[PDB]
Amino acid sequence: PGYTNMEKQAIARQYLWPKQVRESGMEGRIEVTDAAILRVISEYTREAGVRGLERELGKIARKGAKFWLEGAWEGLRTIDASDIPTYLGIPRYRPDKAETEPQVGTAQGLAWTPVGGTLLTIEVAAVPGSGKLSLTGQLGEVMKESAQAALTYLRAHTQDYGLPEDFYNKVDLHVHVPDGATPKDGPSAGITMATAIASALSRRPARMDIAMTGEVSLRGKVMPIGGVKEKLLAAHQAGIHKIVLPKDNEAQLEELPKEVLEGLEIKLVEDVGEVLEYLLLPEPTMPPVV
Amino acid sequence: PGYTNMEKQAIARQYLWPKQVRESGMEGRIEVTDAAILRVISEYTREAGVRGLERELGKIARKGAKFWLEGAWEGLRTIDASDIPTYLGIPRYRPDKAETEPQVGTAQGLAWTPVGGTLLTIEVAAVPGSGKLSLTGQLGEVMKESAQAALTYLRAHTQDYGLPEDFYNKVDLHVHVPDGATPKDGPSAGITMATAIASALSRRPARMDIAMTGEVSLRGKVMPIGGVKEKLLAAHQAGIHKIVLPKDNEAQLEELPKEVLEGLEIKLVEDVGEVLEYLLLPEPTMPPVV
Amino acid sequence: PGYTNMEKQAIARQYLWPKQVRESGMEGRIEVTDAAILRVISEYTREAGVRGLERELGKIARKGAKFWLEGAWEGLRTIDASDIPTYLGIPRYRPDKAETEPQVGTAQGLAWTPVGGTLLTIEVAAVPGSGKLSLTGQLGEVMKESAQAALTYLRAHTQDYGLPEDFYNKVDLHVHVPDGATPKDGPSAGITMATAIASALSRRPARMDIAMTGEVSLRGKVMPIGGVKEKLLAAHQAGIHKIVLPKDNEAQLEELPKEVLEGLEIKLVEDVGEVLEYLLLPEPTMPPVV
Amino acid sequence: PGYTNMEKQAIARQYLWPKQVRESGMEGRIEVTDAAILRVISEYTREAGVRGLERELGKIARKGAKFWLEGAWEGLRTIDASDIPTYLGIPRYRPDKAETEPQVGTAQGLAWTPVGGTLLTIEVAAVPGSGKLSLTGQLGEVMKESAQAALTYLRAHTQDYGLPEDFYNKVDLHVHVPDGATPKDGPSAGITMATAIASALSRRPARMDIAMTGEVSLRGKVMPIGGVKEKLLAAHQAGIHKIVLPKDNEAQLEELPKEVLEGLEIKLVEDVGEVLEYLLLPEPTMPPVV
Amino acid sequence: PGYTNMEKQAIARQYLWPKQVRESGMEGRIEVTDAAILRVISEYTREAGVRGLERELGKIARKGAKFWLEGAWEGLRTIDASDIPTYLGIPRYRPDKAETEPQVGTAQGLAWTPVGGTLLTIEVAAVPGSGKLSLTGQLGEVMKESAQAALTYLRAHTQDYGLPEDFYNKVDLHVHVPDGATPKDGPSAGITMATAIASALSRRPARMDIAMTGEVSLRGKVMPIGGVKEKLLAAHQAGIHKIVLPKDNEAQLEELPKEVLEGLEIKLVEDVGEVLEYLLLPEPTMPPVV
Amino acid sequence: PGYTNMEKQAIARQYLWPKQVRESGMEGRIEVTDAAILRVISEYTREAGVRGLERELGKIARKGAKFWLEGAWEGLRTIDASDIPTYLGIPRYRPDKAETEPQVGTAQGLAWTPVGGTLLTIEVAAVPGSGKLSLTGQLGEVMKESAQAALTYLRAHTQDYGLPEDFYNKVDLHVHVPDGATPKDGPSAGITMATAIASALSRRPARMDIAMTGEVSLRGKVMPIGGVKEKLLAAHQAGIHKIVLPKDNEAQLEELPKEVLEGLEIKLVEDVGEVLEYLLLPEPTMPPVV
Ligand SMILES: *[B]([O])([O])[C]([C][C]([C])[C])[N]C(=O)[C]([C]C1=[C][C]=[C][C]=[C]1)[N]C(=O)C1=[C]N=[C][C]=N1
Ligand SMILES: *[B]([O])([O])[C]([C][C]([C])[C])[N]C(=O)[C]([C]C1=[C][C]=[C][C]=[C]1)[N]C(=O)C1=[C]N=[C][C]=N1
Ligand SMILES: *[B]([O])([O])[C]([C][C]([C])[C])[N]C(=O)[C]([C]C1=[C][C]=[C][C]=[C]1)[N]C(=O)C1=[C]N=[C][C]=N1
Ligand SMILES: *[B]([O])([O])[C]([C][C]([C])[C])[N]C(=O)[C]([C]C1=[C][C]=[C][C]=[C]1)[N]C(=O)C1=[C]N=[C][C]=N1
Ligand SMILES: *[B]([O])([O])[C]([C][C]([C])[C])[N]C(=O)[C]([C]C1=[C][C]=[C][C]=[C]1)[N]C(=O)C1=[C]N=[C][C]=N1
Ligand SMILES: *[B]([O])([O])[C]([C][C]([C])[C])[N]C(=O)[C]([C]C1=[C][C]=[C][C]=[C]1)[N]C(=O)C1=[C]N=[C][C]=N1
Ligand SMILES: [Mg+2]
Ligand SMILES: [Mg+2]
Ligand SMILES: [Mg+2]
Ligand SMILES: [Mg+2]
Ligand SMILES: [Mg+2]
Ligand SMILES: [Mg+2]
């Protein structure tokens, strides 16, 4: 049960969009193309009905009114599919490529060995509880301490990231790094765990088209790591083109083949706040844990 | 004390069925054969009296009314024994073959060694408690972490599977894998433990005519395993013909003898939700834990 | 202070028995011999006074009335000493042979080594507490897990065996297997621990003229064990003639000398419920733990 | 501040004794000698004043009235020093020999090594708490389990020995066996720990002119031990002449030199209740723990 | 959103300063230069608005009134940039050199190895909690005990340092010493941990232009350490010129090159109170933990 | 802020002393010299004001009235500096020699090695808490058990030493023995820990001009130790001339050089109560822990 895509496109054109436009005060000043409407449906909603669709159309109209405040214009400003991220932010869903779409409680990390690099996904669940923490996937002691440092940083910054103020005694956290049997260790997934934990707690989905590596200090400083070449090659080979790396590793980028560096967008960071701002979509997509 | 099977058959024909038919609005449109009634008794009830029997007959009649809504028909639609699963679902009891009948808190898993495969039953009890978890049967650390990942997945999906919302602090769980003395390890019983735990918590019995293998991620992804040939041979040899296997192991099926593959029905899965939907009968057969 | 046996015999004949008979509606239909009365005193009571005696006489009379309901008779049905167990069940006390009389919280188990078998008593105390479990007598990890599986089975079946519904958080249990210094291990005392724990919790005494061996699954399945010959010889040598053994060990009975098998009564079991029904006297002999 | 012994003797003769005699109904029927009064002071009181003295004199008079009930007599029954234990029980204090006087929370145990026996004192404190147990003096695991078995036995028999019903969650226990550095192990101080723990909990002092050895089962059975010759020689050499030994060790007594056996009084026991009845004075000498 | 620096300078001159001066009773007696005002903005405030600025100007004026009380003067006392620390204390912020500015919950420690010295930062977070303590960064047992001793000292001196009276059961502490992978051990960061913990709890920032080393006793005595030469060279090389050292290490200062000793200011301490008074700015810069 | 010593001397002579004398009823019967007043200030007070001074003068006057009760005298009894300890007890403060002055929660212990003896200070903090105990300074298991035995003894004797009745669940204790890195072990600091713990709990300062050694039993017996010669030499060399030693070590004193024994005052003890009476000043000098 629900509307077909055709029905959603039509009800948006005929009812939802004109309603949201007029309620935003923008009637006659902005429009959306058919392709824009379909992109909103496909990449910004996931539902049987159209409540979400209507909310997204309202966001577009209100963002239009913001542009109007910056400066008026004559005639119709037409929003096409290519314009949608300007109004709605980073796509929330990617039905054609689901594995790299944003997800609540996950983050894409990078590991290395003497023979090369490996992508690893950090998974975190936040469930009703009492402040317990589980750390699984055969994690070594250094990596476990890294998770603890990330969690403490978040406990000290609940306001900044929109985390529940009482999660420390009403939520249990579980950090898991598949695959289950393979030992893993080291401090370089500090920012990756901070991202996944913050996502799980806030219910804001983390982008999965970005891979990252960096040690985190307790106060949130991003510290240099090893295996830059191997990790970035592994990302590139897996079709990830957006990277987060510590600022103190900038010198190691010279070691990549120019062709690989060419197809990578690298964000250098000094503070974990920069990571969380880049990785976490602004709006929660699931109800609160408790 | 109770009714004989003969008495149950007769009271169903004379009182229970006609009552349920007329209350469903289907008098004159549907009938059941004597063989159908006996199958309901034998495979869908387990009781001294006939309260359960009457409930099952009501289910048949209401399912009839559903078919009527899809499309009316002229004359009598007669439900025979072979038709009963269309109306009542998968048989709940198999008095002739009790060991493969559905059971609350069990699931059929598959293990391997350098010399072949072995069927292993995962047992789970859910009892009044305070959120404690016991893991017994000489389980290694990887297998214990697998149980923890399965449990966390279920804690995060209580609505989806009809689990109690407060089981995390009102229920103790105990996962046991006989036999008691034999060491066991590995991540490949993740879906098997998820099935047994979900069954115990929901009081919905898990089918025991299906054997399964698959690693589970925290978010419920089913991940590939080893020993596909050995495990499937072991299932076949034990007379299990229905298998659940990770989608990522599809390539390993080529290794089975055509004759063995011939007599196996294999369901490939990517998400643990697909497993639980296939394994767990929809209706609970025991009262809630608390 | 109390009555002598002579006084108890006389007060039973003159007051207690005729009172209980007439209150049961059986005056003139049943009688007891002097030897029957003395057996009731000796094997079914343990007290200074005669409250217990009077209760047992009431049980005899009411059981008489039950036989009357099955079918009336003419004249006097006289109950002699040999008839008493038909009316009162298995003797509760054996003053001439105290070591094999039923006891609250004990069960007779059987162990083996490369040189032969050994009887071992499992002792369990249930005391006011908070759900703690102690396991002592130098028990190995497999044997400890066996105790845990037995306890969980009982937690899941409190109604079936008349266990307190809240024992899991109001009672502490202590399982001890003397002698203190000797290491012990293995899963084959699962049914033995289930018996002793159920007895301690229910305050129903367990028979000590029966020796047992069997692994228990979490759902109560009795599983095969080793050392059948050695264990049964050890029982026989110690003057125990009643044995409980897993059904799956039936084939091993062929290995016993015909003369030994001749003097043993062996009960083959598939479910722990069969064990508890055979071992535990129906009526509690001590007040509840809390 | 307090009375001198001379003042206590005189106030007893002139006021306390005649008051207690007449209040007991025994005026003219019983008397005490000066030596008897001094023994009451010295061996049954420990105080600045004479409240305790007066209580003991009342006990003598009431015990006199008990003898009167058994049978009257003509004239004066005069109680001399040698008669005092008949009226007041075992001496509570021994100012001339303080180390063997009864004490709250201690018991005299016996250990052995390849070169001989050793007396060891078991010390137990019962303090306000929450059910915690500390076991110190470099005790091995078997000896620690022995303490646990003794404590559980006492938890199951609070009525029998006059222990507080709620000690399990309002009292912390600490068992210590000096000297601090010397490792100790084994099950043979089970009765010794039961004695010291029961004494500490009940505030009834344990005799220290008796040395003991015996393993305890959970249900209180006293089980045989080793090193009988070495332990009894060690007792004899230390000037202890009263021994408690398991009944099952009776055969080992033959090994002692006739001269040593001559000067030993040995009590053979089968149940820990027999030990506690012999060791613990009937009346508490300190206020309750809570 | 906020004021530009130019706007802050002007609003201070025109409104904030004259208001604070007249409210302090000092109109006509004190003035501030433009450079002084800019230093207040840059080194004593960190904010979008000017509430903090106005507070600091009020502090200057009230400190002026204090000087007036010590002795009046004729004419205008003009406060220039070089005078600001006399009025406002040690600079709170150093925008040009942020890494050595004071920070809440950090302290600069010094370590050594057989090949030289190393600066290490101790990080501490104080978060809502229940009295838990985490110690991470691969710290050895001696170093962990050192943290415990520092924390206990602070628990015993809450009044002295303005710590919350209930932090012991309402706050969790986490001490972390990056980098995550490198093992660290020893007692010589006792004063360093005391500083960082006291800072985190009090929300008073610790100076980071001072490096320190010293063992702490439970009662706060500062005890001598090793590696004085290596540690002080490492400080000097990193551009730290202010050192805290135990008084008992004064003799080791002779070992430094005269040129290095020349550019170091060394504070010798005997008590941790001297350390905390030197390191912690007097006023908190963040709200309380709970 | 406070009074100068000159002002304190004068205000005592002119106001505080005559007030306290007349309020005690001793006007004209007792006097104090200027030197006595200065000793009271220096060795019995530590304060900015004179509240403490006035209290001490009141103690002197009331002690005078006690002497008067023992026997009157004619004329003026003049109290000089040398007399002050007769009236006020052992000096509470020693400004000229602070390291050996009495302190809350410390005690002077003695250790040995194959090459000689060493003074070691036991430090104890009592802080608001919940009954937790920390034991630090790299203490071995025997030494930790010794601390536990000392603490239990104190828990059983709260009335005797003026300890809080509820410290067992409202106070956390921390025992620390510097230096942090050096391993320490053995039972011979039992009395030393009992002293420091009792001091911390009672807030009564322990003398630090006395060094001690002795094992403690749970019931408070002081037991013999080793290294008497080495320990006493170490004390002597450090300028400690007052020693507490077990009575059972009296024979070892013969081994000291006559010259060393000459300058030592040795108190032989059998019970820890004797130690605490000698070590702890009678009046608390700090407020209660909770
Ligand atoms: B990171 O570089 O510290 C990273 C953290 C996380 C993503 C596992 N770890 C690794 O790269 C480690 C090597 C290592 C680096 C630094 C310190 C210690 C160890 N690699 C792995 O753990 C690993 C696991 N599975 C596959 C490949 N590599
Ligand atoms: B699975 O393949 O990970 C499975 C899980 C569960 C059913 C025991 N385990 C096994 O097959 C293991 C081998 C193994 C596989 C992968 C990683 C580690 C270990 N087998 C056994 O544990 C076993 C136990 N008893 C009998 C036979 N095999
Ligand atoms: B059972 O056969 O598992 C039994 C359980 C219990 C009564 C101790 N244990 C034993 O027979 C063991 C041998 C063993 C069998 C199977 C697995 C592992 C070990 N024997 C003993 O523990 C033992 C102890 N004391 C005396 C004799 N035997
Ligand atoms: B008992 O015989 O088990 C006894 C218990 C207690 C009084 C210490 N223990 C011992 O005699 C042991 C030897 C032993 C006997 C049986 C099993 C295991 C060990 N002796 C000692 O522990 C010991 C300690 N100090 C001095 C002398 N002996
Ligand atoms: B301190 O001198 O005890 C110091 C404490 C803290 C700052 C780590 N530790 C060290 O200097 C140790 C050596 C050591 C000294 C004394 C006792 C035991 C050990 N150094 C290190 O731990 C270390 C760690 N990383 C880099 C360099 N040095
Ligand atoms: B005591 O003699 O038991 C004493 C207790 C405390 C003051 C440390 N311990 C020691 O003298 C030990 C040696 C020892 C004696 C007896 C049993 C076991 C060990 N000495 C030390 O621990 C030590 C520590 N640092 C410096 C010197 N000695
Ligand atoms: Mg990484
Ligand atoms: Mg499997
Ligand atoms: Mg067995
Ligand atoms: Mg013994
Ligand atoms: Mg240092
Ligand atoms: Mg010592």
Residue with tokens 């060990």: C249
C199, C206 Cβ separation under 8 angstroms: yes
Which resolution, in Å, applies to this structure?
1.9
How far apart CA A233 and CA D253 sit, in angstroms, is: 83
Tell the residue nearest (CA) to atom 22 of ligand 5: E184
Cis peptide upstream of residue E80 (ω within 30 degrees of 0): no
User: Residue C142 corresponds to which amino acid?
Assistant: V
How far apart CA E101 and CA E46 sit, in angstroms, is: 12
The one catalytic residue in A188, A199, A202, A229 is A188
F277: Cβ–Cβ under 8 A, 6 or more apart, which residues? none
From the CA of F246, the nearest ligand is: 12
Burial class (CB in 10 A: 0-12, 13-18, 19+), D94: middle
Cis peptide upstream of residue C179 (ω within 30 degrees of 0): yes
C197, C173 Cβ separation under 8 angstroms: yes
Instruction: Please tell me the distance between residue C212's alpha carbon and the centre of ligand 9 in angstroms.
Output: 7
Tokens of F176: 């620390």
The last residues before gaps in chain F (C-N over 2.5 Å) are none
Query: What's the N-to-C CA distance of chain E in angstroms?
Result: 29
E115, E159 Cβ separation under 8 angstroms: no
Tell the residue nearest (CA) to atom 15 of ligand 6: F186
Residues of F in contact with E145 (CB under 8 A): 136-138, 176, 180
Residues of F in contact with D181 (CB under 8 A): 142, 186-187
Tell whether ligand 2 has an atom less than 6 A from the beta carbon of residue B130: no
Nearest-Cα distance to chain E for F106, in Å, is: 9
D142, D246 Cβ separation under 8 angstroms: no
Cis peptide upstream of residue F185 (ω within 30 degrees of 0): no
CB contact under 8 A, B148 and A136: yes
F203, F288 Cβ separation under 8 angstroms: yes
For B211-236, give one letter per residue: b (16+ CB within 10 A) or e.
bbbbbbbbbbbbbbbbbbbbbbbbbb
Nearest of A172, A163, A173, A184 to residue A121 by alpha carbon: A184
CB contact under 8 A, E148 and F134: yes
Nearest chain D alpha carbon to F130:
D129
How far apart CA D187 and CA C136 sit, in angstroms, is: 12
C84, C176 Cβ separation under 8 angstroms: no
Tell whether ligand 5 has an atom less than 6 A from the beta carbon of residue E159: no
Tokens of D49: 């004043």
Tell whether ligand 2 has an atom less than 6 A from the beta carbon of residue B186: yes
Residues in chain A: 290
Distances (CA, A) of E183 to E58, E107, F136, F271: 48, 19, 20, 46
Report the nearest atom of ligand 3 relative to the CA of C112: 11
Q: What is the DSSP letter of C223?
A: E
CA gyration radius, chain E: 21
Report the nearest atom of ligand 1 relative to the CA of A177: 8
How far apart CA C155 and CA B125 sit, in angstroms, is: 9
What DSSP string describes A145-182? Answer: HHHHHHHHHHHTTHHHHT--TTHHHHEEEEEE-SSTTS
Q: Is E188 a catalytic residue?
A: yes
Backbone phi, psi, residue C234, to 5°: -60, -45
C216, C191 Cβ separation under 8 angstroms: yes
Interchain touch C–E (≥3 Cβ pairs closer than 8 Å): no
From the CA of C180, the nearest ligand is: 4
Q: What is the DSSP letter of D18?
A: H
Report the nearest atom of ligand 3 relative to the CA of C118: 27
How far apart CA D25 and CA D63 sit, in angstroms, is: 11
How far apart CA C199 and CA C208 sit, in angstroms, is: 12
Tokens of B70: 């899809």
B92, B42 Cβ separation under 8 angstroms: no
Q: What is the DSSP letter of B38?
A: H
- Cα four-point dihedral sign A265, A268, A272, A274: negative
- Cα B168 to its chain centre, rounded Å, is 23
F194, F153 Cβ separation under 8 angstroms: yes
Q: Which of C141, C142, C156 sits opposite B127 (nearest CB)?
A: C156
How far apart CA E87 and CA B137 sit, in angstroms, is: 72
- Cα F79 to its chain centre, rounded Å, is 24
Q: Is E242 a catalytic residue?
A: no
Cα angle: F203, vertex F207, F211; to 5 degrees:
130
Nearest-Cα distance to chain C for D284, in Å, is: 24
Q: What is the DSSP letter of C46?
A: -
Experimental method: X-ray
Nearest of A228, A31, A261, A277 to residue A117 by alpha carbon: A228
How far apart CA B266 and CA B228 sit, in angstroms, is: 12
Q: What is the DSSP letter of D207?
A: P
How far apart CA F276 and CA F195 sit, in angstroms, is: 6
Consult the annotation and say whether C207 binds a ligand.
no
From the CA of A191, the nearest ligand is: 7
How far apart CA A225 and CA E170 sit, in angstroms, is: 35
Q: Which residues pair with C171 in a beta bridge?
A: C128
Nearest of C161, C218, C229, C162 to residue C190 by alpha carbon: C218
Tokens of A79: 């929003």
A249, A228 Cβ separation under 8 angstroms: yes
The SS3 call for residue C117 is strand
Nearest of B220, B270, B273 to residue B246 by alpha carbon: B270
CA diameter of chain D: 63
How far apart CA E155 and CA E153 sit, in angstroms, is: 6
Nearest-Cα distance to chain C for B279, in Å, is: 19
Nearest chain A alpha carbon to E287:
A156
How far apart CA C184 and CA C136 sit, in angstroms, is: 10
The SS3 call for residue B171 is strand
Q: 3-state DSSP helix/strand/coil percent for chain E, to nearest 5?
A: 45, 20, 35
How far apart CA A76 and CA A32 sit, in angstroms, is: 10
Tell whether ligand 6 has an atom less than 6 A from the beta carbon of residue F91: no
From the CA of B146, the nearest ligand is: 2
C176, C170 Cβ separation under 8 angstroms: no
How far apart CA D111 and CA F24 sit, in angstroms, is: 62
Tell whether ligand 4 has an atom less than 6 A from the beta carbon of residue D162: no
Consult the annotation and say whether D110 binds a ligand.
yes
A202, A128 Cβ separation under 8 angstroms: no
CA diameter of chain F: 63
Nearest-Cα distance to chain E for A85, in Å, is: 25
B139: Cβ–Cβ under 8 A, 6 or more apart, which residues? B147, B175, B177, B184, B185
Tell the residue nearest (CA) to atom 13 of ligand 3: C112
How far apart CA D247 and CA D213 sit, in angstroms, is: 11
Q: Which of A121, A125, A138 sits opposite B156 (nearest CB)?
A: A125
Distances (CA, A) of F142 to D178, E182, F189, F190, F192: 11, 32, 10, 10, 15
Nearest-Cα distance to chain F for D180, in Å, is: 6
C-alpha atoms less than 13 angstroms from C-alpha of E66 in its C-beta half-sphere? 9
Structural domains of chain D ordered from first start: 5-88 (1.10.8.60), 98-279 (3.30.230.10)
Residues of D in contact with F156 (CB under 8 A): 125, 127
Neighbours of chain D (3+ CB pairs under 8 A): C, F
E228, E260 Cβ separation under 8 angstroms: no
Nearest chain E alpha carbon to F138:
E142
Q: Strands A106-113 and A116-128, how do they pair?
A: antiparallel
Instruction: Please tell me the distance between residue D270's alpha carbon and the centre of ligand 9 in angstroms.
Output: 27
Q: Which residues pair with D215 in a beta bridge?
A: D223
Consult the annotation and say whether D51 binds a ligand.
yes
Q: Which residues pair with A242 in a beta bridge?
A: A210, A265
Interchain touch D–A (≥3 Cβ pairs closer than 8 Å): no
Tell whether ligand 6 has an atom less than 6 A from the beta carbon of residue F12: no
CB contact under 8 A, D141 and C137: no
Distances (CA, A) of D244 to B57, C179, D186, D274: 74, 19, 17, 10
Distances (CA, A) of C205 to C49, C129, C238, F39: 21, 21, 21, 78
How many CB atoms are located within 10 Å of the residue F78 CB? 11
CB contact under 8 A, B176 and C141: no
Distances (CA, A) of E120 to B153, D61, E5, E104, F102: 40, 81, 35, 16, 38
Residues of C in contact with D187 (CB under 8 A): 179-181
Q: What is the dihedral of CA D57, D58, D63, D67, to 10 degrees?
A: 90
Q: What is the dihedral of CA E217, E222, E225, E230, to 10 degrees?
A: 140
D118, D236 Cβ separation under 8 angstroms: no
Tokens of E129: 């909690």
Residue with tokens 């398991």: D246
User: Residue D111 corresponds to which amino acid?
Assistant: A
E149, F136 Cβ separation under 8 angstroms: yes
Query: What's the N-to-C CA distance of chain F in angstroms?
Result: 29
Tokens of F153: 């003894």
Q: What is the dihedral of CA E99, E102, E104, E106, to 10 degrees?
A: 60
How many CB atoms are located within 10 Å of the residue F7 CB? 11
E83: Cβ–Cβ under 8 A, 6 or more apart, which residues? E36
Interface residue of F219, F223, F247, F270 to substitute, partner D, most D CBs within 10 Å: F219
A208, A103 Cβ separation under 8 angstroms: yes
Interchain touch A–E (≥3 Cβ pairs closer than 8 Å): yes
Nearest of D60, A257, D147, B183 to residue C136 by alpha carbon: D147
B235: Cβ–Cβ under 8 A, 6 or more apart, which residues? B110, B117, B119, B211, B241, B243, B264
B69, B34 Cβ separation under 8 angstroms: no
Tell the residue nearest (CA) to atom 16 of ligand 5: E186
Q: Best substitution site from B106, B112, B223 to test ligand 2's pocket, by max atoms within 8 Å of Cβ?
A: B112
Interface residue of E132, E143, E152 to substitute, partner F, most F CBs within 10 Å: E152
Cα angle: D169, vertex D171, D172; to 5 degrees:
110
CB contact under 8 A, B190 and A180: yes
A141: Cβ–Cβ under 8 A, 6 or more apart, which residues? A185, E138
Tell whether ligand 2 has an atom less than 6 A from the beta carbon of residue B144: no
Work out how many CB contacts closer than 8 A connect E with F.
Answer: 62
How far apart CA A136 and CA A68 sit, in angstroms, is: 51
Nearest of A261, A198, A200, A255 to residue A227 by alpha carbon: A255
Supply the angle between the helices E141-155 and E190-202 in degrees, to the nearest 10. Answer: 50
How far apart CA A231 and CA A215 sit, in angstroms, is: 14
Cis peptide upstream of residue B179 (ω within 30 degrees of 0): yes
Nearest of F280, F256, F288, F19 to residue F117 by alpha carbon: F256
**Long-range contacts of range B246-253, CB-CB < 8 Å, 24 or more positions apart?**
B246/B213, B246/B214, B246/B215, B246/B222, B246/B270, B247/B222, B248/B222, B248/B223, B248/B224, B249/B224, B249/B225, B252/B228, B253/B228
Tell whether ligand 4 has an atom less than 6 A from the beta carbon of residue D26: no
A31, A80 Cβ separation under 8 angstroms: no
The one catalytic residue in F188, F199, F202, F229 is F188
